[model samples]
Structure formats: C-alpha cells, structure tokens
Target: GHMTIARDIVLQESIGKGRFGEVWRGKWRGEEVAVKIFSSREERSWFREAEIYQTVMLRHENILGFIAADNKDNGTWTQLWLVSDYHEHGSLFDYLNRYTVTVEGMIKLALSTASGLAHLHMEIVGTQGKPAIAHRDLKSKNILVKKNGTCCIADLGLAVRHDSATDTIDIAPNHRVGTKRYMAPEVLDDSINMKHFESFKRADIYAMGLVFWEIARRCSIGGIHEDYQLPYYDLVPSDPSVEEMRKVVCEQKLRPNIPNRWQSCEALRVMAKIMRECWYANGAARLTALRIKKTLSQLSQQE
Candidate 1:
C-alpha cells in the first residue's frame, strides 16, 4: 500500500495559502489533487483535521473530498501533507470576488451549501451512520464551488462532532483559532452553552447567515448587481478583535443590511427573510439547518 502516495502527488501550483501552509494543485496518476501542506508549527490543527477526515462514514458530495494524509521526513524536517480532490474554481470567497452569479446560479450555490450543512448536522440511523458534525468556522473562505456549480464545505480544522449513542461531544482540544469576525453573538459574549450540542450548531447557523449575506450581494438579479461585500465589513476593521466584534455584533446588535431591492424579487425576498431567521441573537430560537434547506429547496423549485 502506497500510504506514501500523498508524497507521490506531483504539486503543480499554489492554489491557496493559509495558516497551516499552502494548498497546491497537484497531479496524481493523471488526476488533479488538492494538497494542503501543513507548517510544522501548526501540527495540532493539522493532526486534528487529518483525524476528522479519517472518521467513519464521513464521505458526502457536499463535503470536501479527502484522499490521503502523510507526514514524511524529508531529511531536514517533517513534511505534513493532506491531499484531496482539487477544484480549479477555488474558494467561494475567491469565486464571488471575481464574478457575480445569476439568480438560478445563486440558488444552486445556496441550496447545495445548505444541503451540505444539513447533512453535517444530521446523524444517520444506520450502522454506517456518521456522527453529527458542527462546522465552527462556517465562512465564505471555508467553502469551495465545483466547476459544475454546487459547493462543498471545507476547512474543517475548527469542527466538532457529536456521538449520539454515547451522547458525547468529541471536541478538538486545541487553541487554534478561527476568524473572530464570524463569531456568533453568544460566542462573543462568553455565554454559549457548550454542554449542549445544539448550541454549536446554532453558532454555525449564525455564521452561515453571514456567508449568505456575502453571496446575496453578488447575485445579479433583474439586471442589477451589487458589489461583493463581507458581512459587517463597514463596522469592523481587518483582523477584527473579540471586543470589536462584540461591540458591533452583541451591543449594537447589527447585521448585514437587506436592500429594499431584494424585497422586489421573490427569490431575493425569501433569502432576505432566511438570513434574518438564521442570524438571530437567541441561538436556540434560530432556524435549524434542515429547516433552512427545506425552505431553500422549496424556493428553488418555485423559481
């Protein structure tokens, strides 16, 4: 078994650069691959991510495709590599920045992303069932769109899983942080109910709302297209701190504005309403990922 096949992955070009190291578009036996090279300093997150990938029954169309994980000693130091299927389109954040999407295209992206989240949240009943997983860092940058259009959620270093049988939460024990700009109000105020698994899911819902806002801005509807803008972009500075986010998100209770133009279109109107439900201050009161998916599916069908 070429457990070292990851090392055999012929790296082409750097597709991305992150906290861990770099992601390269590689070739393995004539097929493309995404190779996430980890920095030695980020060993903890790298190990945690590789562990999550090895989880039983974790494969899904909407989730990232994991191929192999290898830590090879290249004489000088250990070369940590996590390889997977590569999509040329890059992250949703990068895609949205480059071009706006059509109404139909927007719905496709939204529905597929929601389908992914719903799957991540749902615990299958069968013996091959995967545990319910919560993506703590559900931002635009953590998602990728396939060339065919639908998206798959990625960047799972900050993820947590739940075991229904034992009623236990397998939380990763690392201080590796995620973007504070997308933190839920409860998380910012230090009032999150970590004991309850639903709290983590709700926090993800809040971040999803922010990502939806980012997508909505770039949706070219009725021949009008707005520029791509991140949620709370105006209020918070780059590399925002916890206190800065708390002041704007918790104290001021601010959210991304829904333009009046959105109300004019049924699709946009439905999206505007969905964002409000997902980003509410009361985590428990927020709409579940399944509910959102159902609503989005219905809306897409209606269009």
Candidate 2:
C-alpha cells in the first residue's frame, strides 16, 4: 500500500509516552489512529517494531493489528503510523483504575491475553525448522483493552526470536529491556544469558503470571480479596530506582501476599499458587507459558 500523504498533523499534545516514543491521536486516511513518532535516539526501537510486524503474520482476535508504517523524508525520521483498531478503554492499568470487573470478566481478559501470547510463542515450522518468538516485555501497560471488552498485546520493540537449532534468543546488544516490575528474576539479575531460548520463554511466563495476579487483585476477585491490597504494593518500592528495582526483582524473592479472606476458596487458592509459581526465585522453577495457559484454560472450564 502506498504511504498516505495526508497533511502532517502536528501532535498538539501527548496522549501517552513510552521509553522509545510518544503516541498521539491523529487523523490519517480520514480515520483516527495512534501515531507513534520515534525520537532520533529511538530509531532502533522503531525499526524493531517494523521488523516484528513484517516477520510475524499476526492474526489473533486479542492482538492489535499493524496497519501501515510511514518513514517520512524529513531529516528527523518518524515512524509514520501504526493504524491499529483504537479502543478508548485504554490500557489494563487504566481499565482497572476506573471499573471493577467480575470474576467472569477477569477470566475472559486472562484467556484472551493468554491466547494472544500463545500466538506469539507458537513454534512456526518452515522449510528450515521452527522458530519461537518471545515478548521480552509483557506488562499491564503493554496490554490494551478494546472497545468490545477484549485485551491485546502491544509494543513489540523488544521482542526476540529463538533459533530452534541453537536455542538462542537472537537480538542486538544493549537491548536489555522489559518493565522493571514485570521482569523475571533472572532477567533483572542478568544471571542467565538472554540467548537461551528456554530461559527467555520461561521469563515471559513468569511475567504473565504476575500480570494474572495484577488482574485478579484489581478486580478484588480470586485470592486477593483480603485487605484489598494492590498487586505491586510491596514489590514496588517507595523510591523506584533501576538498581533497587533490579535487586528487588532478583534478590528479594518477591511474590504476591495472598489475602486471608481467600483461604477458604479452593479456586482462589489455586490461583494464588499459580501466581507464586510465576514468581519463583529460581528461573528454572517458574512455570512455563504453555503450563500457565493450560492451567488457566482448565480454571476457565471449572465453575
């Protein structure tokens, strides 16, 4: 498709900003899409985002679809646009703040997000072999809620593909990435090399587990009913620093404190166990993404 040359709309105000770029709501092709214009320093991230879109044939109900990318001619380069199906409900963080969801709603969100992650992690067999993809950064902020009440994963800038033969997490250097709170212990500690496929995938699973807890806590459902403490209450320190955050994630042996109110509920208990399994201090002890997906699937089928 030819690049749309609509008038360059100056981003009047920033709607949201990330590590790499700022997103602005703008008019393009007579419809509104989130325009993420990258700073010169973030050109690498912009290119990585484009590479992910190009390589992966993304087609999942819960995943934000890539529309088009524009690399303008100006000296200051811009990632023209990624026209996704915009939803005003905002990120999971925003959604949880405004509304309290029922158990059913939380399950639906969990299932949808898991299915999206499964799609990304699915091993695609080709003429050569199978390649596994990992979302290096999986956090509430990276998850979006559509208008129709479905969640999707976004921001593929830090994604890495695993080579089946070598079992390596292939990526460029200094790319150490992911939300501090959601990162796995090994990732934060740099104890395990990122190139190891199993380690990388396991780390993603660990983050997913934490995300599940965050969802349950915000809704006041499942195991987090007692005292209604927030998900990252203890894990997130008063003074948030990179080194402190890393130490907390690695050395602190962090996990959600299950509420006393949920002690009698078996389902809530199981959910709590799963959350703990995700936050295991030993990277090898953390649940795999496939295992977490299976457990949640079973939980969904139960009453």
Candidate 3:
C-alpha cells in the first residue's frame, strides 16, 4: 500500500525547504497534500518523524495531520516521502512577517499553540494511549498557521517520547540539533539532565516563550505594532552559534525584551507575564503547557 503512493501523487513546485529536504505541494486522489522529501542520508530522521506522527492517540486539531509515508527507489537513488495536510497560511514565522495580528488574533494563535504542546506532553494510560511527547525543536518556523487564524505544531524529527511506567525516554537517533536562538539556558550551557524526561519538556517551554514573544510583538494595539524580529535579534547574529547563545542566555542571563507598551493592553500584559515565567533560569520553575493553556483560555473568554 505504501509503495504505490509515489505513483498516485503528482508533485508540484517546492513550497519550502528544511534541514531534511525540500517540501512540495502534491496532488493525491484529487486532494492537496504537503510532501516532505527527505535527503538520502537522512533516513533516520525520516523514519523517526513518521514513527512519531503515527503514535496512537497523537492526532489532535492543533497538531499537524499525517497522511502517509512512502519510499521509492529510482534508478539513481531512493526518495523518501512523508506526506501531511497542506496549510495555505504557511508558518507562524511567515504569517507574522506579512501581517500584524489583533489582540484576539494573537491570543488565538498563542492559545492554540499551548493546546497543541499540552496535548503532546500529556500521557494517557491505556493500550491504545500515547506516551508523553516532547518537541525538542519548538520554534515559530515549525508552527504552521491555518486558514482559521490558529496554528498547528509540525516537524517531529527530533521529538522524544517518555514512558512513565518504565521510567525511560525514547529519543530519536538523529544528529539534528534545534535552532540555537531558541535554546534554553540549560540546553545552551549543557546543564540539562538528559536522563530526565521533564528536562526535554521544560526546554520546549523555554522555546515556546520565545515564539510567544515573536507573536506578541506583531500584535497591533491601537494602530501600533513593532516590526517582526526573532527573539534576541538585537543581541545575536541571524544564525547564531550555540556558544554565542550560551553566553547571552546562560551567562549574561538576558532574554527578549518585553516592551512597556505591552503593559497597556491586558492580553499583551498577560502574554508577557507568561513569557517571563517560561524563561526562568531554573527549568523546574517554568509553567507547564497545561497551565499556560488554561491561563490563555481564560484570557480568550475576556476578549
């Protein structure tokens, strides 16, 4: 069944590219799907990503929808395909660059993101349940925006699953590292406890705070909105190295600026407060995704 997928899908132009390979819009059974073609040498990441996506009870509205996984061996080389739903709005990074969001719009994006991460971190106790998953690379680029003004978390190549029953962490055997700019202080300084599964989830929360900053900056309040800039844009280079981030995040203890303008708006104020808690130097002190989700949900009702 998987072998015939390549033959049925008609690949169009490339929509985007990542560390794995190029992503193209494809037509499958008269429906559009996003096909991520993996590099020949990145089979491990391809396999791991597919495996993580197909986890039992892992499907959620705020998480990317997996369609299929297939590999084709041509005369020259092999082609790996991981297909999923195609979002017309592209990524949160792309969307924030093009347009500013209203207060309600900002909360919608942030709330949905929290919901997705919370679901990923939750573990169900049953035969058909899913282990707690942590997205090691949580950034704005990996979050795709939907047509409904919400976002879905994607790119699970570096994710890890934790089984509390056995007290073990199932990490992917890939060499891929997360974006340096979003690394938590513990991660940048190499102080993270790899054996502890909560370490991974806490690191994800740190990255999520940076993403929240990115979204909040683009929120238009009374016709005032700042230009789109990545977290620590003023301090680090465009493509910062791990060492550079370690010095800034761990040594200097600096974080993205929370402007005073945000204080005037209740939504922005609450978001900034949440971001502050998420950036705590001690990872154990950071708020859980479920806590953030609940806070945002209450904020949404007031809007």
Candidate 4:
C-alpha cells in the first residue's frame, strides 16, 4: 500500500490547477516533489494516469518522473495523490509567457520535446516490453520545463496504450476530451480512425505542431520577437468552441502563421519546415516524432 508514501509528504503550497484539481509543491522526507490532488469525482483520471506512469520501460529523460500514488481519507473525502518531480520553471506555457528564448534555447526545448515524444511512441519487444503510448492531450501547458531548459511531457490522464500483440488500443472510457484549440483537422472533422492507434499519435503531432509554433514565436532573433501568444490567438477568441476551431482548421484549411523573417535564422527556418510537415491535413503525411527529433538534432548542431 502507498499509505506510507503519503505519510511522509508535507504539502507546501498550491503550485497550479490542473483539469483534475490543484497541484501542490510538497516536501517528502526533505526532497521536493509535486503532488497532483485529484477531486473525488476524478478517480478515473487519477487511476489511469498512475497506471500509465507505472508502465514498464516508461521512464525517459523527456518524460516526467512518477514518484508514488496513494489515496488518503480525510474524514470527509478521499484524496487521490499523484506525486512527481517538482520543476520550479513550471510548464512551457508559463515559461514562454515570461521569457524570450535564444536560438540554442529554442533548439534544446524543441529537440528534447520531440525526443520524449519519440520515446513515448516507441515500442519495445521483449518479455517485459513497453507498449506504445500516446499523450492524447498534448499541449504546451501539459509540458513541464526543467532548469536546464529541456522540457518533459506530463499529464497522461487521457493517454492511450497500444498493444501490438493484440492490435488493440487501450483507451480510458472517460468523458474527458482534448483541448478544442489543439484538436487536429481530422479530429475536428470526425474523420479520425478511432480503431487505429496511429491516428492518436498523428493527432498528437498536430497539437505538437501548434506547440512548436508557440515556441518559435517567442524566439528572439536579431533582438526582435513576437509577443508570446497561443495558436489561433488572433483568429479565435479565448476558450474557443469546437465549432470555431473546426471552421478555421478543417473547413477553411488554415494553420498557424509562420513568420517570414524566420528564414533568416537557420534554426527557425528548419523549425518552420518541421511545423509545416507536422500540420499536413493528411495524418499519414505528418512526420513522426523520431523524424522530428532527427531534424531538430541536425539543426541544433548547426547553431
């Protein structure tokens, strides 16, 4: 039982609010940790995320580290805790909002982000192999940045696992859905193949393409950069509805605007190209995470 795991954690203060509930920074036997406390109504989200984190060979530098999970009853309600590494920098969304990035900073973040995603989408074939996993809700806010500037993918509540042997997708049968703003064209148009596991990965690439745009926009080249803005910030209102996004992304066939000046910076130029490949209307035409990682790696070396 994780009862002992919970006993040592002394919560400090609220760090952020997640879809499930508030996240707190806590001390566990002198070590700092992040504790995601899910509401009693979100037991499924807690359980599913914990299960996904504990999967065999799931550990990677680009993926957030899971410490322990436990449920505690506090007289009135049950508290579900998902503990993980505490990154003071918080999420990529918060990071970009506060500071502009350099060419090196941009490449480090992009390459590591793709590296982690590639690992998540990778499958190992062995007795205790890891199944392919997809972060169905991939977005800038869901990714945490380390002190070194590398980012890690987090929030696996809506993640799905693919069992190649059985050729089945292990999706949580929950009502929770991905953010409408980041939904792919296929997902918005209801043309995605739910029966195929690869469809989820392609959808994730679409969202990642948006995230890359978010990063590239904040990159300062020649001492000039655009204000940090979310994708479709100019076109759609804050908290846009699914219909609003569907019209812009599917019907109108538009993607985020890549700055023309980006061509002057080699790294931004390649990043723009990668973003274009990731946003292809045809899911199969989108570049894989491994391909993205390779492209970014080569670009980083050039800087």
Candidate 5:
C-alpha cells in the first residue's frame, strides 16, 4: 500500500548535486534522511535506481539502508524521490579532508568496506532464482562513515545483478560507466567480456587498495605525511583525455608512490603487495577480494 506524503512537510536544502540528480537533507516522521530526487526527464535512470532497491535487500551493516521512495507529482512532471539512511559525517572524501585517522582506523575502514562489497557479490536466491549483485560504480564519494568510526557504502544507483551467461558483455560502446581515475584497466581498454566480470571485481579491489594508500599517506604512517594529498595527484595529467587515462590505466602501470614513512612495518609490506596485485597490468595475476580479506584478517590478528 503506497501512501502519499505531502512534499510540503519535507524541507529540502541541497547538500550535494551531480550528473544524475540533487541530494538534500530532509525529515520524515521526525527522523533525518538523505533524499535524492532524480530528474523526471531521465526516466530510465530513476527506474534503474528503483529496480536495484527493490531487487537487492540491502541489510548489510556497512551498506546504506533504504528508507523509502516517492513518485511525487510535480507540475508537468513526476519526480522520483529516494530516501536513504543519513550519515552526519558525510562522504569519506569529506571526512578525509577534515580529520586524519590512525593506521588501525584505516584498516578497520577498509575491512568494513570490503565486507559490504562481499555481501553484494554473494549469491542470493530471489523470487526468480537470480544470482547476486555487483556495484558497477565504486568510489570514495559513494562511501560514508558514521560518528562511531564505522563505515558504509552508499548510492546503489549504478548497481546491477549478475544475471545471464551471455558471452558478450552488455556495456555500451564508449559509454564508460565509472569514475575515470578509479576505473579498472579492462574497462578502459574495452577488453571486458563475460569472462571479464571477475576482472571488474578485481579492478574494484584495486581501487579500494589505492584508497587504503590514500588513507595511509594522509595519516603519516611513520614520519612521512601527505597532508591530505590524493595518491598520484601530481603526476596524473591535467584534464587527461580518456585515451590518455586509459593508456596509463592499462599499459603504463602507474602506481601510487610509497611513502618513505612505511618502509619498515610488515603491515605496510602486506598493504603494498595488495595494492600491487590490484594494479597488476595482467588481470589474471591480480589477487581476489577473498584473498585480500584473508590477508587483512591475518594482519589484524597479528596486532
């Protein structure tokens, strides 16, 4: 049973706006929630986002929780409103800019994010007996942290279920899907096929590994401090053409500079190995998420 809630009760102040839509801080039943309203013009995007929420039962503690959705009637258009759990600390990008965390804190954040992704990749039976899902677009902006230091993944607008055994991958030609800097090599090279989904997953693992490096650099593992500079921010081409970025991603083997501070610790050594495996030019040589999880788990137990 769908009930209409008056739009007047929800005071929308734009907090974030992007190519897809605008995000606003809103209240419903006296509880704070982040509201995303997609343009009525892009009906497909709105439907796709809604379809993801309906299909994926988002229950993981490290993933954002879905609150509600409304198809409110606006003058000459119907706006699609998606409500999700509100995190006061905001995106991981914002948090990293404002405060630095300990090595232990960084590792915890990595583990939590990996766990959420694993949950998405897990095979689950739906009404039609479908397999699990995957987050096509994974980046720092899509990750959120709570006040208690726990983190969760947000924004499932680009998520898709891993259904079908088609030999040809369904990506549109040259219609690149992820953020440029974080995209995997295969995605950049257009080498993705049905066999390449695993590669895509590995690419995401690589991005996460780079994010770990970013955290370490920011916190100054030993004596080397980056002062919140992102990895490879200097060397990356200013306004890099897609082809230039693709060449760097696929052929050049660009890697984040290892800070002089972490030259000693075994944790740093393992972290470096994980990041290397992630950025491996050959996708076959890359380590799986499960393997990374196991290594991180062992590292945690050692401390």
Candidate 6:
C-alpha cells in the first residue's frame, strides 16, 4: 500500500515548466519532493496523469517513482498538485546540455531508457497485473536523469494503456500533447493506425530512436564529443511546424544524419546501427522495445 500525504508541502524554487503545468522543487516532511502543480483549466489532464501514476505494479527502477496525489483548496481557487520522487540531476535534456557523457554513462542512460520503455510495453498477468501502457510522449525532456547516472521515464499524462483481457485500448483524450519536434513520420503524416494499440507503441519506439541518437551524440569516445543538437537540427528550423516535419520526415524521406566517426568505436557503432534500424519508414519494421533492450543488454556485457 502507498502512503498518502494530506499534509502541507513547501514549494521552494521553480525548477522547470511543462506544457501542462509548473514544476516546483518541494519540501515535504523533511524530504525533498517534486511537485507538479497543474493549472485549474487543465483539471482533466492533471487527474488522468495522477491516475496513471497510481497504477498498481507500475514501479520500476527505470520508471519515475510516484508518491502522492492531492489538491489544495483554501477558498475560492484550488491548486492541483502531484508529488513524486525528486531527482536532483533534472531531465536528460538539461543534463546533456550541460555536460557530455562518458561511454559508460551513455550506455547506462540509453539502456535504462530502453528498459523502462520495455516494461511499460510489457503486460503482467495474475495478481497485481499491469496493463500494457504506451508512453505516447517519450522525448528526452520527458525522461529524468537520476543521481545514479541512469535515466527514468516520466510524463504519462498522454500515455495510453491496453487491456488485454478486454482486447481494448483505454485512452484519456485531452488537449495535453507531446513534443511535436520528436513526432514520428507516421504521426506527422497522419498515417498512423490509431485503432491498433501497437501503433502507439511504434510511435514511442520512433521517439526512443531519436532519444538514443541524442544520447549517442553526447557520448565521449576517446575523449571527444559532439555538441548537443536536437534531431533534424539541419533539416528543419527550431520549434518546427507539423507541415515542415511532414515534408522533411516523410515527403523528403530524410532523417538525422549519421556521422562517419561513429564507426571508430565498437560500442558507438553498435548503437548507431540500432538507431538506424529504429528509423525505418515502415513502422512495423522498427525493433520492439524488448528487442532493443536485449540488444543493449548484450552490448553492455560485451567489451
């Protein structure tokens, strides 16, 4: 059973902001916590996210820890708050922008990300079974960097869960959205099969591929690293529009360029190969999260 915190939490500094709400570094009962306060207008989004976070059997090392969900109302207005574990390292996006990662660091980050995705995609039966969930939004910013140098998947507000027994997809449709810059070609082209639950998972895979590319770019091999650049930095402008992404990702059949220098390192080479396969235009052709996890697991063991 999870503990409920009905007490007061002191909000200190504003750590960051997301599309849905503002996140504050909070203090609760002498322990640090991350408080995501939702705007009053986005109550549905806030409730949906809190519901998913409280799902049974959802805890994993690579998954963000959920603590408590509450709403504070003093008089006329109310504040929706989601309290969870605090990671001082912040997001992968913020962490990578500040410093490059060592080869070991890169592997740990990528592998943990893959492992988290795999678990989300997996369905556990019997007692306390988990419904297979697809993190429709899987961008670098949606992932947090733990102090252990590993990454954890976050932001399930836009996610969809599948009920195997019912053979149905349970989704909470809302104005809440993901980073369009990381949208898959199928998503941008409006060609994805929304009826098929696996289609959403495929889109997540596509996003993960780009995240892997991001991780690989910052990897320091032989004491060298490339500056952090978002995917399609060369082909598209910043804060790209949907039409622009469709034209470049679909109509032109272009993707982030693979550097020739990657071949020099064995681990980088393997990672580059996996990222390439993750980019195939055919959604069905992309490697499954489990496959990617196994590939990374083997690579981590060898060399």
Across residues 1-303, which tens digit of lDDT does each residue of candidate 2 receive? Answer: 355442443344456865577777766655666667775566767877877766645656877776656555465554444445556777877787677666667777777888888878878786544357788888777788887776898887777887677666667534346776676777677776655667777788778887777777654554344233344567677435557767666666556666665556555666677788877867788776666668778877994
Deviating ranges (above 4 Å) for candidate 1: 1-4, 172-176
> Candidate 1: deviation at residue 250, Å?
0.5
Candidate 3 segments exceeding 4 Å error: 1-4, 172-176
How many clashes would you count in candidate 3? 0
- Shift in Å, residue 136, candidate 1: 0.6
TM-score of each: 0.95, 0.84, 0.96, 0.96, 0.86, 0.96
Model 1 vs. true fold: TM = 0.95
lDDT per residue, candidate 4, 50-77, as tens digits? 9999999999999999998888787898
Pairs with steric clashes in candidate 6: none
Stretches off by above 4 angstroms in model 4 are 1-4, 172-176
Residue-level lDDT tens digits of model 1 in 1-303: 644476577888878775466888989878898989986887887898898887788888989888888886778988788888788888899999998998888888888889899988988878677889888888898799999888999988778899887767897333315579999998888888777778889999998888888888888966797888888889999888999999999999998898988888888888889899988899989988899899999988888
Estimate, for each residue in 70-92, the C-alpha lDDT of model 3 and write its tens digit: 88677889999898999988899
4 or 6: which has the higher lDDT? 4
Question: In candidate 2, which residue pairs get closer than 3 Å at backbone N, Cα or C atoms, i.e. clash?
Answer: 169-195
lDDT against the true structure, each candidate = 0.85, 0.69, 0.91, 0.90, 0.69, 0.86
Runs of candidate 5 with Cα error greater than 4 angstroms are: 1-9, 74-76, 125-130, 164-175, 194-196, 221-224
Candidate 5 residue pairs in clash (backbone atoms < 3 Å): none
Q: How do the residues 174-227 of candidate 6 rate in per-residue lDDT, one tens digit apiece? A: 322567788888888887877788888888898999999998899987778889
Higher-ranked by TM-score: 4 or 5:
4
